Paper text:
The N protein is the most abundant viral protein in the Phlebovirus virion and plays a key role in encasing vRNA in a protective coat. In addition to its critical role in protecting the vRNA and the antigenome (cRNA), the N protein also plays an active role in RNA transcription and replication, as well as in virion assembly. Here, we present the crystal structure of RVFV N forming a hexameric ring. In conclusion, the structure of the hexamer formed by the RVFV N protein presented here shows that oligomerization is mediated by a flexible N-terminal arm, which binds a hydrophobic pocket in the adjacent subunit.
& A resolution cutoff of 2.3 Å was chosen to retain only the most reliable data for phasing purposes. Hexamers I and II in the crystals of the native protein superimpose very well, but the two rings in the crystals of the selenomethionyl protein are slightly different. While hexamer II formed by seleniated N is the same as the two hexamers formed by native N, the subunits in hexamer I are more closely packed about the 6-fold symmetry axis. The domain of N that is near the center of the ring, comprising the loop connecting helices α10 and α11, occludes part of the central aperture, suggesting a twist in the assembly of the ring subunits. Superimposition of native and seleniated hexamers I based on subunits A, creates an 11° deviation between the planes of the two rings. Furthermore, comparison of the subunits in hexamers I formed by native and seleniated protein shows that the contraction of the ring is due to a lateral slippage between adjacent subunits. The different hexamers seen in our crystals and the variability in the oligomeric state of N-RNA complexes seen in EM images demonstrate substantial flexibility in the interaction between subunits.
Residue numbers in the entry:
A (entry chain B), B (entry chain A), C (entry chain B), D (entry chain A), E (entry chain A), F (entry chain B): 2 to 245
The structure:
Amino acid sequence: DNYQELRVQFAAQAVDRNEIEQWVREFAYQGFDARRVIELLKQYGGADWEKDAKKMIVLALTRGNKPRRMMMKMSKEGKATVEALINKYKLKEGNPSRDELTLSRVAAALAGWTCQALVVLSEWLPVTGTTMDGLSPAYPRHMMHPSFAGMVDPSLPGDYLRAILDAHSLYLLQFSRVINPNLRGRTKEEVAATFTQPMNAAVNSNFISHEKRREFLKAFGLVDSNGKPSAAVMAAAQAYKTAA
Amino acid sequence: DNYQELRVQFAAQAVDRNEIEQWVREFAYQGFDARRVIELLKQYGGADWEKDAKKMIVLALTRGNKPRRMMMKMSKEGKATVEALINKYKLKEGNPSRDELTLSRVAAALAGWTCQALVVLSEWLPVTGTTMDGLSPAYPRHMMHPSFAGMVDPSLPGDYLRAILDAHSLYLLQFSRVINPNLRGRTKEEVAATFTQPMNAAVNSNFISHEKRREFLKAFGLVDSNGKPSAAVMAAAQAYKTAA
Amino acid sequence: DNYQELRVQFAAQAVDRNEIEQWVREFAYQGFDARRVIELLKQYGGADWEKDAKKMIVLALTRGNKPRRMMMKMSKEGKATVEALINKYKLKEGNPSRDELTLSRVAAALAGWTCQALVVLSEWLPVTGTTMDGLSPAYPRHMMHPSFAGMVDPSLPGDYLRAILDAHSLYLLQFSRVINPNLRGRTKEEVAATFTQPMNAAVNSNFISHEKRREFLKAFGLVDSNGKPSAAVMAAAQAYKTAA
Amino acid sequence: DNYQELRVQFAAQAVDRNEIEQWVREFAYQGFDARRVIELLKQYGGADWEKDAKKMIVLALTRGNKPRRMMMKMSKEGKATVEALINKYKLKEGNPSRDELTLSRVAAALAGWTCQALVVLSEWLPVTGTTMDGLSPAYPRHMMHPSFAGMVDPSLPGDYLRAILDAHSLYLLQFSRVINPNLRGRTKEEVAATFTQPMNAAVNSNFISHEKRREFLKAFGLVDSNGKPSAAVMAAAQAYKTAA
Amino acid sequence: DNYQELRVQFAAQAVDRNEIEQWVREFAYQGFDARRVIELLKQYGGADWEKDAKKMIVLALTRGNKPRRMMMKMSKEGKATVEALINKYKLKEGNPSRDELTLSRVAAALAGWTCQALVVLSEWLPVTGTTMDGLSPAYPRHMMHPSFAGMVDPSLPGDYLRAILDAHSLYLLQFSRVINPNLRGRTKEEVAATFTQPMNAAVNSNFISHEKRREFLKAFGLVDSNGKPSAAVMAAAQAYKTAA
Amino acid sequence: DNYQELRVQFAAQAVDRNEIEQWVREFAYQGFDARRVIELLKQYGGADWEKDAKKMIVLALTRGNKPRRMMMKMSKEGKATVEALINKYKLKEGNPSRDELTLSRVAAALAGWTCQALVVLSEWLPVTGTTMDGLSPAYPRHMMHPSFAGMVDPSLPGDYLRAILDAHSLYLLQFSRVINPNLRGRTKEEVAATFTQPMNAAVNSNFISHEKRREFLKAFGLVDSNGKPSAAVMAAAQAYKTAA
Ligand SMILES: O=N[O-]
Ligand SMILES: O=N[O-]
Ligand SMILES: O=N[O-]
Ligand SMILES: O=N[O-]
Ligand SMILES: O=N[O-]
Ligand SMILES: O=N[O-]
């Protein structure tokens, strides 16, 4: 019938904030699917899934996300362990489908442990805690993996949240440059453009509730009882502002 | 068979301004066919077309115009929703025939609702309202999509019309550079050349009467009862004049 | 027999100015073949050829030389008209053979009318008359298409002819930049190099006699009874000298 | 089988300057075989070869050395003429075998006429006489083709010869850059390296005796009765010295 | 099937420093498998393996790691020798499996001899001893191959160890740029990132005991009886600090 | 058995200077094989080999190393001579196998004569002796071919040897630029990098003994009875230092 009238009638319909925001979340960029990662770990791993996941996290943090490549530069024993992990958990490189595991995904799905492991693994990461201390004193080790974004409570007060993300970004700037010998022709802003979408996706995901995320941030020593960031976090956020 | 004479006699024929301008309008650039878009929505969607159209507008404004691509990085629920929408509405990408739907066409055909939805969607757009506010105070959220051009009454007094279009162009300028990173190095003038044709086409189209367009402008708070643009529009029109 | 003597005997033959110059003309660069264009229009079009040619000229001036592309961004009605024109006149894009019509060729073959149409179509061209007025006051609208080169009488006095071509070139510089987002790394001289060969070919063609061409230039208000260019032409030629 | 001894005895053998220089002349660069070119013209052309050769020289000087390419942008009459010439003379492009004709070879073999034709063809060459006049007053029109090198008497006194060749090189320098746009950024010295071999080859070739070459130079007004270069040559030789 | 809870319980599990560091060592980068290399040499070579290994080390240090490529530019005798070595030892290029020999692996596995051979091979290396002497006086010849890292005792006092490794890195810095010309434009820090992993891997490997490594350092004159680095090492460690 | 002990036992083996240096020589870069060149010349040429080799040397020096290409720009007679040489000696371009002749290889294998021929061929080389005199007075003609490196006695005193190679390098810098219109974006050091490996290979080859090489250098007037370079050589070496 009358198309102009239909458009006009359509414009007169409610602009429902609760409804729209639900769709935004449902349709938002998702870098990885944590619930599917953990389901697949439990599926492939049975009783061994927890111990194997810790190994895989150590592999992700100290060797990276390419299982077949790291095998080419590894001890005979280590290589056999990794081959057995690839075979058991059907591990892939890069960004495969939802139904496929990667080392990075295991690390991100279980970031509550990953971030703690970083306290131990500091001197073996692509960028060491020693280096980070040179940019910002007592740089929080818990922030030293892309996984950490899954620990950030997005409901923190505007300035606290910003401090946390800025402080984390200081690491992300260094890390991205080290793992990519191509971001040489890249400013701070240009490097950020490649890391903030996966960062923000994890910050805003529905995996681990806001309260549980903040509890982790508190237990890690990154915020106090009110969500105010620690001295170290404040220092690292300040360093990000003046970093290039 | 005297061709020079034929060329000459052809030159002696009336240059009828009325007849030629009618041909200009017939042949003019058209970005989309709003009437056909509504018809196709009504056709494919039946009783669900209205709710589906809103979802499709939210997708268009927050994720873009490529339904297959966005699905690769999305929650399981959202991926299922978009898949079904693709199958139900035979969604395509880019600029197919008038007999085919895209996400951008849905938002353009139903601009009256799209522009109200921008108020809610502000923080989630490729260029946020907060970013717009740094260029021009309280930038009108209703102007923050190419769709807005379909709400502009071309019968507005010259200076009021130009103010509306200049204010809108301030957004178009930022948005075009974000969506097409290869326009970052181009001048305002050059970027304008890439958005001006679809803008003017929607401004001057026969879809939705001038009187209804103006009443949307009045309802949105963009003009007053006497056709005069608000302070926010004037501010934004001035920012566009001195923008780079 | 003796090759050296044959070359020497050959060198002793007349260097016939009338004969050589005839060969130059016969062998010169020809961008399009106006007589073949008009023959094909009359062939394909019958009684409708004159009206259709005017439509095609309007299409060429306001949409360009790509019939299948412009159809993708056009009203349903306009698109059906163009499809019928393509089918009837076997229209092609770019530079096909002598035996093939294009919109550009129709415009150039009938430049006596095309140049007059420009007075009407000014504000709808890729570069508007408004813009040209910003570079040179009262810029002659008749000069605002590559077609105009077919109107230039090459027997005009050296300085008058130069003024006409310089004034036209001011437009050609702007036009070439607008239709080619590649001549960004191009100086005035570099842009000229791409437009002067088609310009000069048409200036020197044997289609429309020198006297008839000058009559057009006079009727257009571009020269007086002695071939002296108008004030507007003189201004535009001066602007070309200092343009970059 | 003592190879060092064989190498040694080989070194002890005469270095005969007369014998070696004879080998230099046998093996020297030859740009074209003038005798064969005339023979082929006479063969393919019969009674029409002289008139056809002149047309071919006009083509070579005003359109270039690619008969198939030039045909694509030419009048109907001219296209038919070139087609027939291609078929009658089996014209080729570039540098085929000595048993094949090109347009450039015809002009080179018949340089005595080619160079006189330059007087008439001046405004229509890739570098015009008027352009040459801006570099050196009254630049000799007879020097404005690579063909001219075949008219140079190498037995001229050193300083006269060098003046003729320097004056000619002024043209070669401009012409090489026009014909090969990728030489615009190169130094005079570098451009010289690209034209000097065919130049010297024609200067020193056995086609047309030194005495007849000199009498052409005298007839052309390039040298006087005592072998001395004209003012125009001297001027042009000096302009080449200080050219970039 | 509560995945958040599973993630949470996983986070509550011990972060056992001893257990995690054991996993780091298992999974650590390994450049080559020295034990397997010797086994393969002994296997393929029988009674000739020792003499063949020395030839292979000389090839590695003076020609590189690509046996097929070097053969193309070599004396007849040498080409025959390398061909036979390739056939006898099944030599490969690059980084194949642990069950395959390369020239570089032979030199690395047998580093104690390789490093002594550098004294003799000095003038014939890609970076000569004389060049090293210009950067740091009497640069230790024993350090002038990546192999040297396998002679470094990691149990040396921190400052002595670092001095040995810094002195060695001065060579690694020059050598990496010569071998990979695309590293000439990179910073010291960037070049270091390309040599540090295989360096540290050999430093910390379980092949050859710390005590035997140190006694090689003492025998080579690189440290004294009290573990202290020689003047030459200290000089070279200082040159690395201020190197670009 | 015990791999660590085997490596340690291997390190305890002699580092035999005489033995190692023999392997270096056997394994060194070889650009061409002079003994194989001369054997092939004698094989293919029989009684005509010596005269044909002189022709081939003249061809190499005045036309280059591409027999099929030079034929395309040559007299009928010269071309037939070269075709007969290609057929008889199975000549190739570039760097084919040991068992294949090239013009360059004939020139280098017989450099004792080649270098003498250069005194005659000076003004016909790609870079003339006249040009070289402009860079360094009385530049030694004998040095004006890559072949000359086969004449250099590497046992000359350090400073004399360096003078000889520097003086020769002055030519090599000019020559490499002239035969390669790509080394335009190349410094002196960058050009040297392309010519020193073939230079040094020939300087250090075992073809023609040190004493015989020095005898040639003496007979050429390039060194005196003690091996001290002439004035001309000293001048040319000095010019190389300050050349760019
Ligand atoms: O990318 N979703 O954490
Ligand atoms: O082309 N916009 O209706
Ligand atoms: O290009 N001939 O008008
Ligand atoms: O090679 N010119 O006769
Ligand atoms: O990985 N070096 O033993
Ligand atoms: O490259 N051996 O002379």
